[PDB]
Amino acid sequence: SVEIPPRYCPLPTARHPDETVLARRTADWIDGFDLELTPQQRARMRGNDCPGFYGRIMPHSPTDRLQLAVDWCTVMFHFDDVHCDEGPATGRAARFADLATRIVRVLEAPDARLEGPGDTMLAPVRDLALRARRWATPAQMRRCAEAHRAWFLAVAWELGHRAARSTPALNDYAHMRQHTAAGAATLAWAEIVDGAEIPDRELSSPEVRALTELAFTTAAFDDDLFSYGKELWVARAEGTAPSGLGLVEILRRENRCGRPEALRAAVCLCNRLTHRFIALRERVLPDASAPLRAYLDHLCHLLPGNLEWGLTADRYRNPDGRTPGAVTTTASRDTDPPADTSPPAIPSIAWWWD
């Protein structure tokens, strides 16, 4: 049982009307390769509710194009559950770096034939890259590859902490978590689904970079909150301390406080990030191009949609897939903005408030 203190997110959420079609097709898609999925793994993929996640990001998008983003979520939720922090401990970091660079190369060069030493991941990734190239501009395809590099470099960072069972300092986690959560790689598909390139001049501008990092960090921190109970449910089944790779545990260790106080501090931070995102959005929207306005629309649906999906998906409530209701997370809504709109004392992210 986890009670999340009141979150400030005055943004509307909507679901895509074709979740069932998207679910049917993404299951049939992933079953078409050679991943040798067990019924347990197929059940857990259902619990991930990838159509509900990305459908909440792009609830007005055409179903056949949204399928591309949903299918990416399907295979990368699997990649995470099987190829991240798994396998023998000996040579684990080398194994990950090798697989990661093949995935990136296939996104750049779908016929690179980076072979199969018992490989399963690259065939679906190649299918995604080929499908994306039918719709994406070359710049959009570049953005996907680079966003995967940022995610994968962050995973190598995370795996170092997991192997040491160490807890990152808040200043380090605060800018890294957007990358370990694959925020940019997740959202890079959206402008391809939209079918229009966001101008580089806009995406690279400091105000849009701030908005991007604000949105992905908030969503990742919200994930730390709605996946916190699943973390405690894992630490209780393995009898170990909870992982330090989480905002709650980081604030607990950093403030020498108890779990309720840390949950409050984590939500307080999420609320200030959310308020800053909304405030900065208002200053950016007047001069935004139509593709940038669309991008900001997706980030605005991401924040409340991610929360709703995370609080209800069986991924965080029935973790192993055979324990209905093992974890229950509740959350409140704070209807008032944070009283403190100043930058937090976190130098690695303070420039979002510039």
Ligand X SMILES: CC(C)=CCC/C(C)=C/CC/C(C)=C/CC/C(C)=C/COP(=O)(O)OP(=O)(O)O
Q: What is the DSSP string of 76-137?
A: HHHHHHHHSS-S-STTHHHHHHHHHHHHHHHHH-TT-----SS--SHHHHHHHHHHHHHH--
* Residue from 26, 274, 306, 318 binding ligand X (CB under 6 A): 306
The answer to whether residue 334 forms part of the interface with ligand X (CB under 6 A) is no
Point out which span in 175-183, 235-243, 273-281, 326-334 binds ligand X (CB under 6 A): 175-183
- Quick check: 80 binds ligand X (CB under 6 A)? yes
CB of 310 to Mg ion, least distance (A): 9
Q: What is the DSSP letter of 5?
A: E
Helix spans in the chain (H) = 19-30, 39-48, 50-57, 63-83, 92-108, 122-135, 138-164, 170-180, 183-194, 200-203, 206-226, 228-237, 247-255, 259-284, 290-312
CA–centroid distance for 191 within its chain: 17
Query: In the structure encoding, which two tokens stand for residue 34, read together?
Result: 């050679």
Is 223 annotated as ligand-binding?
yes
Q: Does 227 contact Mg ion by CB under 5 A? A: yes
Q: φ and ψ at 170, to 5 degrees? A: -55, -40
Q: Provide the residue type at 53 as one letter.
A: F
Among positions 137-156, residues that touch ligand X (CB under 6 A) are: none
What is the closest distance, in whole angstroms, from the C-beta atom of residue 227 to ligand X in the complex? 4
Could you say whether residue 296 binds ligand X (CB under 6 A)? Answer: no
By rule CB under 6 A, what string of x and - marks binding of each residue 308-327 to ligand X?
A: -------x------------
Query: Is 293 part of any known ligand binding site?
Result: no
User: Cα separation of 246 and 209, whole Å?
Assistant: 23
Number of residues that bind Mg ion (CB under 5 A): 3
Measured CA distances, 331 to 6, 112, 130, 219 (Å): 6, 46, 40, 15
Q: Residues of 274-302 as b/e, b for ≥16 C-beta within 10 angstroms?
A: bbbbbebbeebeeebeebbebbbbbbbbb
Where does this chain touch ligand X (CB under 6 A) — which range of 98-106, 163-171, 220-228, 256-264?
220-228
Residue 306 binds which one of Mg ion, ligand X, none, with CB within 5 to 8 A depending on kind? ligand X
Instruction: Return the amino acid letter for 334.
Output: D
Is 316 annotated as contributing to ligand binding?
yes
C-beta closer to ligand X: residue 182 or 280: 182
Tell me which of 122, 192, 211, 220 binds ligand X, using CB under 6 A.
220
Q: Is 274 in the site for ligand X (CB under 6 A)?
A: no
Partner from ligand X, Mg ion, none contacting 220, C-beta within 5 to 8 A by type? ligand X
CA–CA distance from 208 to each of 98, 192, 220 (Å)? 32, 18, 18
x-or-dash pattern for Mg ion, window 62-81, by CB under 5 A?
------------------x-
Tokens for 178, please give them.
Answer: 């957007």
Q: Does 158 bind Mg ion (CB under 5 A)?
A: no
Q: Would strands 329-333 and 2-7 be described as parallel, antiparallel, or unpaired?
A: parallel
Q: Which position among 158, 191, 222, 223 is part of the footprint of Mg ion (CB under 5 A)?
A: 223
Report the partner that residue 183 touches, choosing among ligand X, Mg ion, none (CB closer than 5 to 8 A by kind): ligand X
Q: Which is nearer to Mg ion, 3 or 86 (CB)?
A: 86
Find the binding residues for ligand X in span 42-71 (CB under 6 A): none
Using alpha carbons only, give the angle 153, 199, 57 rounded to the nearest 5 degrees: 65
Q: Is 114 in the site for ligand X (CB under 6 A)?
A: no
Q: In the complex, which residues of this chain contact Mg ion (CB under 5 A)?
A: 80, 223, 227
Binding-site residues for geranylgeranyl diphosphate: 177, 230, 315-316
Binding-site residues: 80, 177, 223, 227, 230, 315-316
Q: In the complex, which residues of this chain contact ligand X (CB under 6 A)?
A: 73, 76-77, 80, 181-183, 186, 216, 219-220, 223, 227, 302, 306, 315
